[PDB]
């Protein structure tokens, strides 16, 4: 009976310990997962009671997805796009780094049956979602990623990302200010999907949009929300507007941590259960 751990500051938030504990007894695999508090400051400290202590691994969150790139063996080219990783996996003392939240949010996508391949991407954000997102997009094949971040503290974070894949990738990523309501109403018209990874549309802003006009979406488009809290995103009700194909915030919360059940268990993760369960 190995532990998976969650090694942030703070925890209480936290739905994985829940999601992952009812999906480890729904298969009866001899796992447990445990949350504890941890910051930078103990997180080298708590990397090395992983080791000692043989745990299987454990999921990161803030604030030590960045600094926790630097504890593990292994990291997957679309991590060292990203800079930051929210699950360590631990194969018998050699640790490797993954992002979830990356591949999770892309899977939601493969499964509603629609193809990256060649496709152009809007994304909207530079933060944690968004970045993971896109390196994850652009390592599956995505031809364009027509990223908008305005000028605060992430803009530069989205030129030196444009920057990695650009470098590493056959992916082509450029950057534009998001108050230039126009460029972008022509770069949501010449994109396949539409990909929300911004706080906007989440409680108290659980009334504000990115998207001005509904009429700048179309109806073969597809929009993807990272916000599941509420469920319709402001973005969502103007997209089941125009008739776009739509996927909300519990996909990619829930096939996220799918990734890391198998990745810990090796098994399947009883998805369809999990979602039952967590009242979705
Ligand atoms: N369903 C899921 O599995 C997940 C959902 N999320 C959600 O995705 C969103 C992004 O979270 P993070 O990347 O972790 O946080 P973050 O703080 O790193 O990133 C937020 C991003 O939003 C942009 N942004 C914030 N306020 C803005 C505004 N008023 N106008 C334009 N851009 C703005 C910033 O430029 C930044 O890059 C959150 O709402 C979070 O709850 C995050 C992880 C998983």
């Known amino acids: 009976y190995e532990l998976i751990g969650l090694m942030a500051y703070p925890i209480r938030h936290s739905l994985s310990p829940e999601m992952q504990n009812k999906a480890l007894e729904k298969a009866g695999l001899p796992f447990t997962y445990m949350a504890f508090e941890v910051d930078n400051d103990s997180f080298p400290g708590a990397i090395e009671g992983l080791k000692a202590l043989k745990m299987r691994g454990t999921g990161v969150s803030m604030p030590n997805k960045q600094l926790a790139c630097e504890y593990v063996d292994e990291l997957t080219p679309a991590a060292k796009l990203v800079g930051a990783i929210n699950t360590i996996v631990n194969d018998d003392g050699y640790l490797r780094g993954y992002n979830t939240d990356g ?164 098994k399947d993760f009883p998805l369809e259960y999990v979602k039952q369960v967590m009242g979705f």
Request: proline fraction near 2%; charged fraction near 20%.
């Open 103 to 266: 591949t999770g949010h892309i899977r939601a996508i493969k499964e509603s049956g629609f193809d990256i391949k060649g496709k152009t991407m809007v994304l909207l954000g530079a933060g944690g979602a968004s970045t993971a997102i896109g390196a994850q997009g652009a390592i599956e094949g995505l031809k364009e990623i027509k990223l908008f971040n305005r000028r605060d503290e992430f803009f530069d974070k989205a030129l030196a990302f444009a920057q990695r894949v650009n470098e590493n990738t056959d992916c082509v990523v450029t950057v534009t200010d998001l108050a230039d309501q126009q460029a972008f109403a022509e770069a949501l018209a010449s994109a396949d999907i539409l990909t929300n990874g911004t706080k906007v549309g989440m409680k108290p802003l659980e009334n504000e949009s990115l998207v001005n006009d509904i009429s700048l979406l179309h109806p073969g488009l597809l929009v993807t929300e990272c916000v599941y809290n509420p469920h319709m995103t402001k973005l969502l009700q103007q997209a089941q507007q125009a008739g776009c194909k739509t996927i909300d915030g519990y996909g990619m919360l829930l096939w996220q941590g799918a990734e890391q059940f198998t990745l810990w268990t090796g």
